[model samples]
Target chain A: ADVTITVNGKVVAKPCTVSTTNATVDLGDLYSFSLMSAGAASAWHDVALELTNCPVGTSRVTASFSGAADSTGYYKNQGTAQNIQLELQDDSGNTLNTGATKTVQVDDSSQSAHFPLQVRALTVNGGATQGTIQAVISITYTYS
Target chain B: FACKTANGTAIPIGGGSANVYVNLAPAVNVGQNLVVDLSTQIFCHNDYPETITDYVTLQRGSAYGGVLSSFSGTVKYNGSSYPFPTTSETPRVVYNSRTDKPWPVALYLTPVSSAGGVAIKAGSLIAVLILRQTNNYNSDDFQFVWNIYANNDVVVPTGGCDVSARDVTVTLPDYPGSVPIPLTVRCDQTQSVSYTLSGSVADAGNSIFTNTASFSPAQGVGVQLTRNGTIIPANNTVSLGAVGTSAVSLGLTANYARTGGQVTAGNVQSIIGVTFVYQ
Candidate 1:
């Protein structure tokens, strides 16, 4: 009478997952191009990135960003915002180039990473076309 | 990377596979009132260190509807034979077509083997299953749901049994002259004939069978029905049962009594339909 079957499913811990696949940063009711000029910047809007369930392994994780940007380090406008570009910044207000990678150290004691980053619009050539605003950046993660 | 076992032995994160063997034989012609010894057909080696339990359920096959839900017979489990449920006081319970779900029949309860009750260290554990059909019905390939449950909750593998059905067709002998007979009934008189019923033999081991009869236009002017010597009401039935393909005889008598006025002879006919129920 003492016979039983052990459920044969394997559970292994490994690859980590991100909190969200898609993140949105709302600049909210953008600018009134009238008072805008070359080198003028709009107020900054913030967004956060979070990671969880880091697998047991050696060392760190890095996130690299890729998007269209102007020579001056501003995200190139793909919408109706001609002469205006968006700028990306790190949690400490340090500028993060459109195509750059940032790494974070992970240890057994600390297995997560989440920090706020900011974005703002900058007028470059002065024509500053008005309508809608839009920009996109793809991020890739590497574990080492 | 590698993980360490309790003894600190390095177990690599590499992949390997294991295969299990279960002995099953080709299908046999197991029909009603017949049985198939399922001992060798079902067995397993306890390669694991823990005891394992197996439970088997018989499921209905293609002809699931025509065959009645309740089954009649016994099952041989672990060298001992126990008949399936039929009555409340009986060890086995009848399958309720109304409330019972599929696989209503249960067999081999907690079938398992062990050593010292801790774990199944070595040796092969085995059990037997005997499937018998008692009712008389022609079920072509009635499927038996054979499932092996290990450790009560773990499902190991599955198997099946092909249970066929049995049938009988009532063959009516040719009428004497192949025509209806005309009879002239006088005041308070009657006329009748005893007809013989013949049919193919019932399925093997199924000798119990029954049949009833009815007549179309059961009653007519100065005409009525009677069986053996008793007058049967319109649409009423009379039955008989026996073994083999022998002919059964039943009297088909017609009666006529006094009428209000002088009765005149007219054309009258009755078509009798026979119903056969077998078990």
Candidate 2:
């Protein structure tokens, strides 16, 4: 008699709870004169992607950003603001372009990780129009 | 608490009343030196034909069970420090058939021993002033009860610098703006002073202080303090060079900076604790 041993198992990435799933970062009123010159930017606003309750075996987590990118590689402003783009930077001040990924280590004690990021309004082209600015960026986490 | 007065039985001498009250400052430091004025006036008539004497004395009342050894008293008469009995057993003669009406009685209380001083407590009865006629068993004995109330948990002066105002408020312009806060510190002697600004919350990277408003607080904005164009981080101590006994003006600018995501319209408020250390 022949027996079939079906070892059923699925490989999955150890998951951590996303503490901040829906967060809004206010880029508060930016003056057109401040972003008048090309490559000019506004003050950096802090944003954090928090992960908590990570499994014991997960030591690191990577965050991948997805958003509409302009020709300058910054997130495109979808609001009424004209010629203004949004820029995201890691804790080290390195620009996190659209679709870019940043990896951080999980704390051993709390089993959590925080990706400190910053967002700001920038003018890729000279003379940004005075209007409300908004940009939406989605983050995907991969635990290891 | 408001000052309270307790009156004793009226003395039959020239229409006078033994009214006493203790008025304390709303708040006092622990080791404050000076005797708080215990306002009172005691006048009694001598037994006209009997040559009898009348006296007034203070005793620890049953309302407060604390130690009374720290307290002493003085009576002021004719702009001079008159002798007054402070203990429960001692008495000071106020009237006698031989002397004219004694000057108006004024009482004072001095808390001795800076180390074993009065404890900080709420208002309650502390002492009783009794006016009695010597060698007379009558119901005419007057009792003036003393109740003291004050806030005792006040910051002790370091004698280094005197701040004009302990609490200050700085209003920022609408949003994306700045304002200046002026602080004056008068030093008692030449000394170097340092100040540390702390708050309940700080922005990412701890560069700015966040508001404590729990309701719909304005978003993406924080407060940053700058002195002479130099930005001061939250919780970091900055030193001011040696200042003489004169008052020194400190010009501090509080700027509203973009700290988080988009700015939202809401109430923005924060309390920054300022600590000054003199060396």
Clashes of each: 14, 9
Q: Candidate 2: fnat, from 0 to 1?
A: 0.00
Per-residue lDDT of model 1, residues B18-55, tens digit only: 11112322221122221223343233222221332222
* Model 2 lDDT per residue over A1-144, tens place: 000111111112367899999878886777877777888888888888889987544567899999998888889988888888889998797888887899998876676889998888888787999777878998898765
- The runs of at least 3 residues in candidate 2 whose Cα sits more than 4 Å from the true structure, single-residue gaps closed, are A1-144, B1-22, B25-35, B39-145, B150-161, B187-193, B241-245
Candidate 2 TM-score to native: 0.40
Over the stretch A63-114, how does candidate 1's per-residue lDDT look in tens digits?
Answer: 7888998876778878876778888888776777777878765544556656
lDDT of 1 at B226: 47
Instruction: Return the TM-score for each candidate structure.
Output: 0.30, 0.40
- Which candidate has the highest TM-score of all? 2
Put down candidate 2 lDDT per residue, B1-279, tens digits, no spaces: 011232333333322332233343322222223233334322234544264445544433312223432344454433555334433333444554543343243444443221122333434333444433333334455444433333233322323455656667767766555677767666545668666667655666676777655665665566777878988876676777676667776667777665664334465676676666654
Name the regions of candidate 1 deviating beyond 4 angstroms: A1-14, A33-35, A107-110, B1-279
Please tell me the interface RMSD, in Å, for model 1: 39.3
Candidate 2, B50: how far from true, in Å?
A: 9.6
Interface C-alpha RMSD per candidate, 1 decimal: 39.3, 29.7
Question: DockQ for each candidate?
Answer: 0.01, 0.02
